[PDB]
Amino acid sequence: TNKPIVLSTWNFGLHANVEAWKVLSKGGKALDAVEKGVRLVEDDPTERSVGYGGRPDRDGRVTLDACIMDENYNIGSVACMEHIKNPISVARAVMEKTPHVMLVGDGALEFALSQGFKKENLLTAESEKEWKEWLDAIGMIALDAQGNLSGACTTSGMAYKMHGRVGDSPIIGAGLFVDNEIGAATATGHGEEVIRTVGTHLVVELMNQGRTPQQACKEAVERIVKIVNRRGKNLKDIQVGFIALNKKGEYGAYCIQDGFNFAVHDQKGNRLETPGFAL
Numbered sequence: 001t002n003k004p005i006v007l008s009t010w011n012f013g014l015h016a017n018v019e020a021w022k023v024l025s026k027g028g029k030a031l032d033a034v035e036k037g038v039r040l041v042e043d044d045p046t047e048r049s050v051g052y053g054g055r056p057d058r059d060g061r062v063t064l065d066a067c068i069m070d071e072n073y074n075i076g077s078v079a080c081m082e083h084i085k086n087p088i089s090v091a092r093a094v095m096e097k098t099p100h101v102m103l104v105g106d107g108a109l110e111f112a113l114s115q116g117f118k119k120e121n122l123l124t125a126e127s128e129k130e131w132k133e134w135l136d137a138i139g140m141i142a143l144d145a146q147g148n149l150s151g152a153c154t155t156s157g158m159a160y161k162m163h164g165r166v167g168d169s170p171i172i173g174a175g176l177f178v179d180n181e182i183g184a185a186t187a188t189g190h191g192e193e194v195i196r197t198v199g200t201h202l203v204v205e206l207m208n209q210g211r212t213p214q215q216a217c218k219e220a221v222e223r224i225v226k227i228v229n230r231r232g233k234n235l236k237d238i239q240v241g242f243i244a245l246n247k248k249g250e251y252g253a254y255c256i257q258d259g260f261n262f263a264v265h266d267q268k269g270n271r272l273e274t275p276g277f278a279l
Helices: 012-024 030-043 087-097 106-114 125-134 191-197 199-208 213-230
Strands: 005-009 063-069 075-082 102-104 138-143 149-155 176-179 183-189 240-246 251-255 262-266 269-273
Touching: 005 012, 005 030, 005 183, 005 240, 005 251, 012 030, 012 138, 012 262, 012 269, 030 063, 030 087, 030 138, 030 149, 063 087, 063 176, 075 087, 075 106, 087 106, 087 149, 102 106, 138 176, 138 183, 138 240, 149 176, 149 183, 176 199, 183 191, 183 199, 183 213, 191 199, 191 213, 191 240, 199 213, 199 240, 213 240, 213 251
Parallel strands: 075 102
Antiparallel strands: 005 138, 005 262, 063 075, 063 149, 138 149, 176 183, 183 240, 240 251, 262 269
């Protein structure tokens, strides 16, 4: 087993990975490492797709989505929540502190305030300016030193989405799925398409059915390529990629289109790698 190891989506994943490695390199839990890592990007206002610099919906509101899943089937999720900069920690709190698994809208903000999170204005002058002018997610999965898996996914969703729109990031089996006997996967791309195909639950069930992380990501994407063609859609218009990790610390990735990148931090260091791709 290659462990610990963290992977996360896109360039900003390298930095997010340095925060996660601070936990993991000291034999910390995968759960704490992935929450710590994606929180770095939620706090960053120049990170315009996750938390605090997020581009608002078409009504000018920054509403955030997130979910988390640990090594023993516990899960927490929040969607279309406003004024809380760290939705991954409110999602963790849904998991640890309620009988429920997903809270949305005003009920999710009411629960967050009840837990001590502080209401903040997440609309930056830069995002407000671009919004009025107009008028993706970070996923991270990790295997810690105990050989346990966890993942976290967080986004501001599509810029100028309809008020109330939810993507794949707060949905288990769409933006994130972890099963500690098999592996973990997180998704990148168009929310709607990852939901439609329930993509990450499919990646992990193909690792369950014997596939390598890389093979599983590729076959999943290829299943998605066949569905957009059956839907009569042009592949150039839709993107979807996955990164995956199994129990032995092997990892893989694949996407419909070229141009995505993901960060891998293990004991060889942190690096940006480039997936295989179909088109």
